[PDB]
């Protein structure tokens, strides 16, 4: 067989009566989840995977763009000098798992090597009819509600020697982040367990040291649109933007409580789908609360550190294909002959 590009279909456990928008979308875009999921191990088979060049990622991006365009309608769209107005009702918006499945004539191969970094040969391969269920969570900096690594933190990068390449981190132990807009209406905050977060950075440093045996520094974002300089996400149908300086401000040499992140709810946002701004209605009243798992990170490594005893990493993101890649890295589509 051979790698191929096709249109995968999607499956989900959506319900007809839910007005939550992922359910509504999946009701017409997907089939019910597979009643009979089977993995078939391929004996003695080796296969090349590349999470960074994977058309599954490209289709998922297209699909979640259509989900958002149908679901979260802004009052006004500012694409170019133009202005496009429409009805702007508040909605229930909470991701559900979506599976991607092979059409007839095709197969999805799955890397079963738990230590696979995302690019290169995999010695332990199976065939599947569908991926696992993936929540299409849109966020920057912190990856939420995703899959976890089994034994140790994973550092995934097309080539980490190249400072222009995005770094996707996968955690082993999830870290709860709890965000609240209490009953100024735009003001909110996120809480993170300090001990857990510090243990998380320790584990991440341990793996990064395998690539750079140096002092490892975490520093905050140093530029870009608000969406990428903050941890942005949505909750309760509202868009949150959280300062992550208190998460990314530490130095870890070879040796010798609660973190509070302030947040703001924005009405003016930069679309991730395409270039342009969108305006949404002022915030709903009442209490808004989201409790999520941090399961990964998107990082950038400072370049040009010509002769330093340290490497510096900062939170990054913005290309949501990196979010889809963090889940789809172990899959590829092939045409069976």
């Amino acid at each position, epitope marked *: 067989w051979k790698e191929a590009e096709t249109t995968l279909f999607c499956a989900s456990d959506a319900k007809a009566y839910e007005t939550e928008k992922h359910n509504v979308w999946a009701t017409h875009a997907c089939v019910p989840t597979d009643p009979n999921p089977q993995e078939i191990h391929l004996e003695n088979v080796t296969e090349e995977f590349n999470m960074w060049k994977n058309n599954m990622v490209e289709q998922m991006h297209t699909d979640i763009i259509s989900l958002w365009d149908q679901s979260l309608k802004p009052c006004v769209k500012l694409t170019g000098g133009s202005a496009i107005t429409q009805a702007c009702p508040k909605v229930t918006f909470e991701p559900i798992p979506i599976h991607y499945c092979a059409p007839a004539g095709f197969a999805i191969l799955k890397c079963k090597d738990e230590e696979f970094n995302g690019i290169g040969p995999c010695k332990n391969v199976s065939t599947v009819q569908c991926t696992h269920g993936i929540k299409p969570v849109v966020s920057t900096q912190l990856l939420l509600n995703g899959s976890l690594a089994e034994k140790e933190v994973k550092i995934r990068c097309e080539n980490i020697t190249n400072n222009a390449k995005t770094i996707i981190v996968q955690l082993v132990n999830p870290v709860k982040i709890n965000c609240t807009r209490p009953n100024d209406i735009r003001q909110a905050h996120c809480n993170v367990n300090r001990t857990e977060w510090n243990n998380t950075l320790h584990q991440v440093v341990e793996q990064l040291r395998k690539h750079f045996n140096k002092t490892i520094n975490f520093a905050n974002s140093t530029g870009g*649109d608000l969406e990428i300089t903050t941890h942005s996400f949505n909750c309760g149908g509202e868009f949150f933007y959280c300062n992550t300086t208190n998460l990314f401000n530490s130095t870890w040499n070879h040796t010798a409580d609660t973190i509070i992140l302030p947040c703001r709810i924005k009405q003016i946002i930069n679309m991730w789908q395409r270039v342009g701004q969108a305006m949404y209605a002022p915030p709903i009243r009442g209490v808004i609360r989201c409790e999520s798992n941090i399961t990964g990170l998107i990082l950038t490594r400072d370049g040009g550190n010509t002769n330093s005893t340290r490497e510096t990493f900062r939170p990054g993101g913005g*290309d949501m294909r990196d979010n889809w890649r963090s889940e789809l890295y172990k899959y590829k589509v092939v045409k069976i002959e």
Partner: antibody
Amino acid sequence: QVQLVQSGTQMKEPGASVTISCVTSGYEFVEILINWVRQVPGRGLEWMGWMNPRGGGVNYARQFQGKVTMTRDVYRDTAYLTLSGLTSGDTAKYFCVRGRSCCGGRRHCNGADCFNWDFQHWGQGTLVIVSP
Amino acid sequence: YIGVTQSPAILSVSLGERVTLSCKTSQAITPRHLVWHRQKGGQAPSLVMTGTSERASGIPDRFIGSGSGTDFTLTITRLEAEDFAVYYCQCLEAFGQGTKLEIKR
């Protein structure tokens, strides 16, 4: 044809700020990382940083952190370099520059997908002279 | 950070001569990552080689790129007047300090 065209020579007093523009044409601006390179007269090439025009994310060389700001206006196909707290050490020629494209007409294109460092298309350079 | 060293910094050469420019990386690299540029009179540099050995647009076949590991070379088989310039190797964000071709007398 791809073209990067920069603003003209500037003279600035010490302590002042300066902004250099880099207006691009002949390709999809938002799809390719912009880099800036400094060259003090008579000296070698020094990479300063890159900026992703999609979202405006940046990466600055340590030597220039606190000195440089790299921004863009996507609607105007223009990248900017701003230098703050000017000193005599900042007198130099500044180039905007981009490497080869990689998207190959695929549906979704981001500059971070490319190699970046096969620098191919340069602006003509902008001289900044720091003097009171 | 992988450093780049170019030495000699000045080569004194003559028309018609075979000239060898050297570039050394501080650790081993893939040849995919080594680039050569030339610059005349402080104007915008222009591309000579990418991926160690593939000639850029407009570059004639008297320019030959080779090397692997940490040691890379740009060879000009027969020097012409238009070839006199400063040549820079680039590896990722790092530049060498340049080699200037000068007229021997």
